[PDB]
């Protein structure tokens with residue numbers, strides 16, 4: 001995946017959690033479509049710098065999608081006071097700018113750790 005502050009093992013775990021790390025297309029989630037490898041919504045894609053040729057094109061690319069995650073965490077993680085490890089990055093990915101502080105994402109982190117080789121992933 002793209003390089004950055006998020007580890008490759010963490011990105012792999014998130015990728016597997018969202019789509020079994022496959023280009024699965026989109027689905028509706030609480031008002032907006034989440035797409036591709038990392039199930040990224042348009043707003044997230046905008047916030048990570050509009051990488052790729054378009055939102056859905058980027059989402060369908062493991063590299064572009066992972067770069068978007070890298071940029072999103074560089075933008076919000078430290079700002080929101082998240083631990084700079086997968087626990088914080090995963091929750092930010094699932095809950096937004098301050099996702100690592102939302103109780104809603106506690107379940108996402110716990111479910112993600114159930115994936116082979118993802119328990120306590122950093």
Ligand SMILES: CC(=O)NC1=C[C@H](O[C@@H]2O[C@H](CO)[C@@H](O[C@@H]3O[C@H](CO)[C@@H](O[C@@H]4O[C@H](CO)[C@@H](O)[C@H](O)[C@H]4NC(C)=O)[C@H](O)[C@H]3NC(C)=O)[C@H](O)[C@H]2NC(C)=O)[C@@H](CO)OC1=O
Pocket residue numbers: 018029030034038039040041042043044046047093094095096097
């Ligand atoms: C069950 C489940 O959770 N499913 C999925 C969750 C997840 O999608 C994530 O969904 C959340 C909430 O809808 C997204 O959070 C929003 O993120 C926005 C983008 O950063 C953010 O909007 C920004 O907000 C800041 C602060 O106000 C502003 O300064 C920015 O200008 C603004 N940007 C824009 C372009 O509007 C917004 O406030 C968040 N909303 C809330 C309620 O927090 C989050 O981004 C989603 N994550 C992704 C990767 O898309 C995914 C994968 O887990 O899809 C799910 O199915």
